[PDB]
Amino acid sequence: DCRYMFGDCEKDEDCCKHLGCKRKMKYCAWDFTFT
Numbered sequence: 001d002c003r004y005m006f007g008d009c010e011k012d013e014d015c016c017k018h019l020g021c022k023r024k025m026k027y028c029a030w031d032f033t034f035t
Contacts, residue, residue, distance in 0.1 A: 003028045 002016035003009055009021035009028045020032020 005029060 003014050003019075004016055005019060005028050007015065007028045008026055009015050009023075012019075012021045012032050015021050015028035015032075019028045019030050021027070022029045022032065
């Protein structure tokens with residue numbers, strides 16, 4: 001299943017679709033895009 005916020009991620013696919021992967025934190029954030 002997907003990972004929600006603070007869950008580990010390689011790519012955004014690892015995270016839920018309500019989220020995005022922060023490669024800086026290696027965890028899913030609510031977005032991946034820097035904004």
